[PDB]
Amino acid sequence: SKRYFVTGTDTEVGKTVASCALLQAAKAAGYRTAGYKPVASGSEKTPEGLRNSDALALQRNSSLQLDYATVNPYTFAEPTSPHIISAQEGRPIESLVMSAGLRALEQQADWVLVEGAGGWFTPLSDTFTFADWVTQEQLPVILVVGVKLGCINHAMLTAQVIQHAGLTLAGWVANDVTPPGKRHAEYMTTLTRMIPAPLLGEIPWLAENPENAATGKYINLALL
Amino acid sequence: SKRYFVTGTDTEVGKTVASCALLQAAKAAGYRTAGYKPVASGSEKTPEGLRNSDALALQRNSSLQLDYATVNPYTFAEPTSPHIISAQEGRPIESLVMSAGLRALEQQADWVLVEGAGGWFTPLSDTFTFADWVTQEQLPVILVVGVKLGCINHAMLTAQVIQHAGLTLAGWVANDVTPPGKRHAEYMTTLTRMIPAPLLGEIPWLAENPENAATGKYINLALL
Numbered sequence: 332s333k334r335y336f337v338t339g340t341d342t343e344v345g346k347t348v349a350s351c352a353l354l355q356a357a358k359a360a361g362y363r364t365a366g367y368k369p370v371a372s373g374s375e376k377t378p379e380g381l382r383n384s385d386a387l388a389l390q391r392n393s394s395l396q397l398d399y400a401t402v403n404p405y406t407f408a409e410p411t412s413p414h415i416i417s418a419q420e421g422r423p424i425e426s427l428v429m430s431a432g433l434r435a436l437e438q439q440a441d442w443v444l445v446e447g448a449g450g451w452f453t454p455l456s457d458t459f460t461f462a463d464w465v466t467q468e469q470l471p472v473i474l475v476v477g478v479k480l481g482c483i484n485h486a487m488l489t490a491q492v493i494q495h496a497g498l499t500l501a502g503w504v505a506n507d508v509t510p511p512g513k514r515h516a517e518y519m520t521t522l523t524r525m526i527p528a529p530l531l532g533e534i535p536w537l538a539e540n541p542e543n544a545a546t547g548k549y550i551n552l553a554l555l
Numbered sequence: 556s557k558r559y560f561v562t563g564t565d566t567e568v569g570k571t572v573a574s575c576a577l578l579q580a581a582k583a584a585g586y587r588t589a590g591y592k593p594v595a596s597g598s599e600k601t602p603e604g605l606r607n608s609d610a611l612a613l614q615r616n617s618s619l620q621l622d623y624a625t626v627n628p629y630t631f632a633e634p635t636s637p638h639i640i641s642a643q644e645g646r647p648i649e650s651l652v653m654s655a656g657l658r659a660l661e662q663q664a665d666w667v668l669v670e671g672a673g674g675w676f677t678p679l680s681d682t683f684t685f686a687d688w689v690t691q692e693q694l695p696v697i698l699v700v701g702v703k704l705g706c707i708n709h710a711m712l713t714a715q716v717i718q719h720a721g722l723t724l725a726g727w728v729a730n731d732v733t734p735p736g737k738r739h740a741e742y743m744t745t746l747t748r749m750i751p752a753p754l755l756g757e758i759p760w761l762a763e764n765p766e767n768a769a770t771g772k773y774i775n776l777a778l779l
């Protein structure tokens with residue numbers, strides 16, 4: 332079944348918004364979809380335990396009705412690097428558990444999207460990063476680029492490292508994190524030339540609740 | 556004579572503030588110093604033409620009295636990627652001119668610091684990036700890390716790419732861009748373990764005019 336890992340040029344660049352757009356587009360194409368956020372930090376308390384907003388957005392945007400834990404096995408309240416809070420709370424993040432969770436979603440979905448945490452190299456322990464897991468799984472990677480000053484360097488750095496790891500950069504998504512700026516078009520042309528992967532689509536600047544905006548239309552799944 | 560290229564995990568992470576600290580420390584050590592900002596964007600008009608604040612900070616912090624043009628040959632008013640504004644204004648950025656400017660400073664200084672623009676991969680033309688020039692010059696690189704969420708990934712990405720290019724990562728500087736946060740110490744430990752270069756020093760959060768604060772004391776030049 333189809334599976335993709337979604338990373339970003341940094342934390343807060345739009346991985347979640349783009350992932351929802353990707354999920355909506357797959358559903359529109361006829362796929363039985365599932366979003367997976369194996370490791371999450373920055374979560375709120377609820378009667379059922381801790382709940383992460385990214386995990387909730389991916390869960391809502393999946394065509395299948397999924398249990399929270401199936402979408403997000405590891406939930407930490409504090410919004411910091413996974414490895415720091417995991418060590419402080421004494422709750423190890425295990426590659427095997429993250430991989431088991433992906434297989435579990437594949438029991439019912441034929442199109443799975445995996446959102447990472449932060450950027451490419453976000454640590455999970457003192458000796459293991461998210462990149463290590465993505466490489467282990469041999470997941471094709473989709474790069475979400477928040478269009479802003481500094482994004483060219485970050486996109487280039489991330490694309491080079493992904494390719495070096497022997498992984499496939501399946502595509503990139505341009506996300507308009509802010510209203511139209513002076514050099515928007517020039518940045519889009521530069522990004523298009525430099526990222527060795529197809530531009531899947533561009534998500535407009537959607538001020539109000541973009542996680543729940545109908546954004547699937549901005550993604551051309553046939554380029555993936 | 557000694558020469559170092561200063562890059563950062565992104566634009567606006569403190570390359571200029573750290574460069575001033577580095578320059579002050581070298582001067583304290585007895586060196587005849589010179590800061591060099593070959594390419595600059597985001598500049599103000601003056602009676603003498605355009606003037607960039609980074610270039611002005613490096614000029615002020617050099618032990619030698621340097622002419623503005625010697626410090627910054629290429630000055631663009633608009634604060635965007637060098638390649639975009641250079642093309643729009645029809646003023647090509649030439650590797651040869653940038654290299655000639657470095658040699659010119661070396662006529663009088665025995666310790667030269669070169670501040671890049673933006674991050675590692677900032678484009679200078681449609682086919683040439685700053686990284687290309689740094690590689691051509693075989694300059695040892697100092698990585699400035701603005702201590703904040705997302706910096707681990709960026710530091711790791713930049714360090715890997717620099718090493719891959721066959722260049723020497725001479726050291727890194729931790730810059731406190733914001734007041735003390737919850738996981739400061741844990742981030743410093745993670746950064747120290749992961750960056751394959753000596754931590755040269757840490758610049759405290761200095762709210763008021765940090766470019767002109769006495770920061771040389773935070774750098775241990777003997778580790779460089």
Ligand SMILES: Nc1ncnc2c1ncn2[C@@H]1O[C@H](COP(=O)(O)OP(=O)(O)OP(=O)(O)O)[C@@H](O)[C@H]1O
Nearest residue numbers: 342343344345346347348449507535536537538541
């Ligand atoms: N296209 C957009 N238009 C308007 N706002 C956006 C857009 N994309 C993202 N945002 C907003 O910017 C913020 C960051 O986006 P998002 O949560 O998707 O990023 P992220 O990369 O998933 O971050 P994290 O590393 O926490 O997983 C959010 O508040 C989001 O609502």
Ligand SMILES: Nc1ncnc2c1ncn2[C@@H]1O[C@H](COP(=O)(O)OP(=O)(O)OP(=O)(O)O)[C@@H](O)[C@H]1O
Nearest residue numbers: 566567568569570571572673731759760761762765
């Ligand atoms: N240690 C610090 N304490 C307080 N403020 C700081 C500190 N370092 C940097 N700043 C502020 O943060 C901003 C960015 O820093 P700086 O100009 O040194 O970054 P930069 O990486 O040189 O950016 P550019 O890519 O434009 O060259 C500036 O307004 C600066 O005054």
Ligand SMILES: C[C@H](N)[C@@H](N)CCCCCC(=O)O
Nearest residue numbers: 481482483484566634635673
């Ligand atoms: C305006 C800004 N401070 C410039 N001096 C450097 C910006 C370069 C950004 C390049 C990129 O998008 O990676």
Ligand SMILES: C[C@H](N)[C@@H](N)CCCCCC(=O)O
Nearest residue numbers: 342410411449705706707708
């Ligand atoms: C709190 C934040 N939104 C997290 N979900 C992801 C942050 C990871 C940052 C890791 C790093 O410093 O590179």
Ligand SMILES: [Mg+2]
Nearest residue numbers: 346347385446
């Ligand atoms: Mg997210």
Ligand SMILES: [Mg+2]
Nearest residue numbers: 570571609670
């Ligand atoms: Mg600067």
